[PDB]
Amino acid sequence: PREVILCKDQDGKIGLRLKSIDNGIFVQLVQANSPASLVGLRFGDQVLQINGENCAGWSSDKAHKVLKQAFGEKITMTIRDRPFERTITMHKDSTGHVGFIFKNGKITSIVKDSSAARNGLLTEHNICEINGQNVIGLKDSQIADILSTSGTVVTITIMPAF
């Protein structure tokens, strides 16, 4: 658990969208070049507390109601670094592929006798990083450009789509 302080920029907005998942509050959307982006907030981070109050059981509307109705331009948050994050290493075959089909940044299929198949890569998982580069927010064709310019080793970080 870590504590991040956020300064509200002009319209009392943090550039953050939160979602209620399994009675927890998670980071769902982080706008680029925003107060939230600045202090390290990433897709899949868990918010434990907002201004010292527990987020447990809060609905998605409650979390946003709290963030806007907060007095003063400073909001403290206690965060847990993407708890659902897993890393999987794969190798390109002779055709330059590791073996998976994706749509909207989410793995939808695994090709038989592929590197993804040998390494137990899962479907219904969003891709977060490829070889260190963040891919949340990129269009599918830009993600394919990163995969295409990769060496033989393809390490991807994934999380269940939820």
Ligand X SMILES: CC(=O)c1ccc(F)c(-c2ccc(C[C@@H](C(=O)N[C@@H](C)C(=O)O)N3Cc4cc(Br)ccc4C3=O)cc2)c1
Residues that bind ligand X (CB under 6 A): 93, 95, 97-102, 111, 113-114, 140-141, 144, 147
Q: Which one of ligand X, a second copy, none interacts with residue 93, CB within 5 to 8 A by kind? A: ligand X
CB 129 → ligand X: shortest distance, Å? 13
Nearest to 66 by CA among 82, 79, 81, 49: 49
Nearest to 2 by CA among 33, 62, 45, 36: 45
Q: Which one of ligand X, a second copy, none interacts with residue 123, CB within 5 to 8 A by kind? A: a second copy
Provide the sign of the torsion angle of the four alpha carbons 151, 125, 79, 76, taken in this order: positive
Q: Which is nearer to ligand X, 5 or 101 (CB)?
A: 101
Please give the DSSP secondary-structure letter assigned to residue 47. E
Say whether 92 counts as a known binding-site residue: no
Query: Residue positions in the annotated binding site?
Result: 104, 139-140
